[PDB]
Design a protein around this nucleic acid. Structure first.
Lengths: 99, 97, 111, 82, 99, 82, 108, 97
DNA sequence: ATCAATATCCACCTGCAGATTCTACCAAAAGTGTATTTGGAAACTGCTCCATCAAAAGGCATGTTCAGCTGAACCAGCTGAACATGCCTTTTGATGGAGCAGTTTCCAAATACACTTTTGGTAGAATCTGCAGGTGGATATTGAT
DNA sequence: ATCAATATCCACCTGCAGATTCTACCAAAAGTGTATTTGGAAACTGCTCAACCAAAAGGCATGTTCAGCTGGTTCAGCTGAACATGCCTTTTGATGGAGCAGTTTCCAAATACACTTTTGGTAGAATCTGCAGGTGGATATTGAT
């Protein structure tokens, strides 16, 4: 019978692994496509430098990690371990990210 | 004889108020708040215009830099109506030399 | 020596274009300032003042008051999404807050 | 490709990001909300970047335009010049 | 026997009353004395203008009301109606008020 | 006898502030935490205000010094000049 | 025509006083710039640079690496209370985050 | 023949690194990060000094405004050690004329 | 507490991908001497600030009571972590030509500056009226029945 | 439903503190004219970007299993919300000198600004070496028992 780890052990292994390294976790190509589609609705036939896309990816990723950190603290606050949309909405509301 | 001289936007705010609501006054505190508001928006716009000019190795602040600064700082329809007023004002100024 | 006409009247504005020009020169913003910049800026400031005073006068009429006080300015700003965004981190002295009570603590319905 | 859009930002990548945030367990409904949040952030930044681009009469968005757009939102980025 | 309201009704009356009005809720004199003590620990024999004290009072109260709003959302999030120190600590941590 | 002087920000005033915040019920331990929070905020502001005082070679703290100190903390205050 | 000395050497600094002076003049900060301002500023920048590099070098030795990389700078900044305050809202490219897992969820 | 000229703080950062840790190098990306850092702190300090000068109706930026700005922007012991270094530097400059 | 099955370290080799150093030259740092503003020292002065009383009253410090609240188990779905298998978008390597970012040069138009000259702005004095308090009455709510 | 003790809305009145207007002095806003410099626009070029096929390959989709997570239910302290009571800290004139924030005027002193003379910093080319990548074993981490 195959060896089987209980739920949570591997998640923790991924946390330690990804917190030890610095490489980018989102794929480059779909990010470029998303950027180009959004940019199209403001101005047509725009081009992008590759370092501009790397900068946007770094900014996006740093923003999301910070939000997941705040979300996790809100989840833990409610005696839960599962993050839910209402936690994200709370974090963004308190920072003033009013969308 | 000593007496200094402190400027404010009070008289202009009162003129605009009388234009928009002829039958209405304003307290001194509120006028002070409006003056603070005006000063804050002035610094924000001029500072942003300054950074744009510096980034583009440009030594002049023109109406273009103001327009761009406005589009960056203000959201949607507020920006569109303000930009329209500024454009119309500049065209009126340039015509009536 | 033609007769003195102000820049404000030429622009059809109430705000002082000349003073704004002096303030741009004095304040280390740029070495030189174009003629159109203060007209545009004055127009923007005048428009925003008219919008705030408009909403504040509506709030004034709602409270049957003919004089605008700071409270009305706070109500005007916080009830307008765009002004709230612009002034989201700004404190209006003597402004107070909006009559906002979170819906779930106010009293029970089968009562 | 499934939306020609944000859906290319797949579930496992969002999971990885949550892992870097120290999150152990994730509800199935988080992903779409995160996508929307990301899209909003991106829109505002790109809007300002393109505005700087338009001011210079340039058709190429540079890294510096992004850095300044990020700066005005209080998210100063180091490492890409200036 | 004296007439007696249930817990919560008058609290709500106080909410409506103070949210309708704008008068300062902290006493002027203790605030002045607090300010003078703190300033004394940085520089001696300082004086203060009355409007400086009023400005500080307005700032303090606006800051505290905003923090209590965020605190209340954090309490409600935990399926509670009572705010606790951990709610304030969470709100300040998410704003980055790290102290 | 007086009470270390931080205590003049009494319990009922804090209760009133919480009421303006829409708070209905308050634990007894909130007050001391709130006092510390207020002290930190005040300490930072006055420090900057006094720094502005010292630079001007003035012995009177003006409203403008406070306004600037608040501006640098991202808590811009309107109504007291500038 | 005495021999050419520079201000960084006279001030006992490594950072370039002259360039800082030119940058102050160019950037619309003030109409005129005093002689001492760029020296003081250069000294402050040198002290702060030395402090960051010091901590990053310590982090570098803990990882048995002889070259400083961005990760070591992020670790240095977030582990210093004062630098974290100064750079609390700054993003360090390729920095990552601190190995911080909230205690209650880590296993029994 | 065309060639431009882009300045950076690279050479000075490398000299300081060799003074503090002789047996250590630095990657180009990290050096770029340090240059960005220096530019940011420069802009912050000069901008703050400018506002102080404007508030007190002074047209000159001196070592005093730098000192005050430093005390405002930087926290506690970091400020004290940096301020001490600046004072030491100005004192050595003024004496070795 | 020990075996089983993975995970990740401890340690080494190689060579190569950036990283450090060498050579050149020119653009910025620095020196010299003139011209120009500016910080500070001292005199004037009257506006505003700390300290004291004084009498009161309105908030608050203490004490008493109980009603919803808080935490705490128990458990019935239930849905969300892990793996297999397998299919495929993404990635790495090429290719190469097209557009334009960026540099250089020139000149009408834009704009600073010095002198002059009229006048809109602002401070204090003189109205004047809108709302802060006060009185009475009339609904409109809580809560025991 | 009923119904009695408080809270709040609303009509009306009053008068005075602050809003509004009037009248004066002048620093600042326009007008002329002249000197400065700079932004638009055209030419060029080689650095960078969009397209784009081939392959390989590591990542994502779908489906299955089942483990423990979460919200509904309920229950015994509990403790924090309202009142009553007395009291003492805070409010609001009034005084009333002390000191210092302006304000001006003078004058050494710090610093722009034109010109001249080097030389430190950076762009390209020539060496260099620390760790990315790969691998071989040696222990650390949990699941089932």
């Amino acid at each position: 019978k195959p060896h089987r780890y209980r739920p949570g052990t591997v998640a923790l292994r991924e946390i330690r692994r990804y917190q030890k390294s610095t490489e980018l976790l989102i794929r480059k190509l779909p990010f470029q496509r998303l950027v180009r589609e959004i940019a199209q609705d403001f101005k047509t036939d725009l081009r992008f430098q590759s370092s501009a896309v790397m900068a946007l990816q770094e900014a996006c990723e740093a923003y999301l990690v910070g939000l997941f950190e705040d979300t996790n603290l809100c989840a833990i606050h409610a005696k839960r371990v599962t993050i839910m949309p209402k936690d994200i909405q709370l974090a963004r509301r308190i920072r003033g990210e009013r969308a | 004889r000593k007496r200094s001289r402190k400027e404010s936007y009070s008289i202009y705010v009162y003129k605009v108020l009388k234009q928009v609501h002829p039958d209405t006054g304003i307290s001194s505190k509120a006028m002070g708040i409006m003056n603070s508001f005006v000063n804050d928006i002035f610094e924000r716009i001029a500072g942003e215009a300054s950074r744009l000019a510096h980034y583009n190795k440009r030594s002049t602040i023109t109406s273009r830099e103001i327009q761009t600064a406005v589009r960056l700082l203000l959201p949607g329809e507020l920006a569109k109506h303000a930009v329209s007023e500024g454009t119309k004002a500049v065209t009126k100024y340039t015509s009536a030399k | 020596r033609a007769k003195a006409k102000t820049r404000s009247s030429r622009a059809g504005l109430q705000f002082p274009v000349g003073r704004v020009h002096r303030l741009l020169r004095k304040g280390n913003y740029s070495e030189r300032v174009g003629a159109g910049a203060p007209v545009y800026l004055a127009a923007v400031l005048e428009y925003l003042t008219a919008e705030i005073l408009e909403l504040a006068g509506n709030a004034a009429r709602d409270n049957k008051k003919t004089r605008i006080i700071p409270r009305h300015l706070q109500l005007a700003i916080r009830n307008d999404e765009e002004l709230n965004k612009l002034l989201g981190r700004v404190t209006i002295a003597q402004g107070g807050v909006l009559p906002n009570i979170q819906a779930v603590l106010l009293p029970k319905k089968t009562e | 490709v499934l939306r020609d859009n944000i859906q290319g930002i797949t579930k496992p990548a969002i999971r990885r990001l949550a892992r870097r945030g120290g999150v152990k367990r994730i509800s199935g409904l988080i992903y779409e909300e995160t996508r929307g949040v990301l899209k909003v952030f991106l829109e505002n930044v790109i809007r300002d970047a393109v505005t700087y681009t338009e001011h210079a009469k340039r058709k190429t968005v540079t890294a510096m335009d992004v850095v300044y757009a990020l700066k005005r939102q209080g998210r100063t980025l180091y490492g890409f010049g200036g």
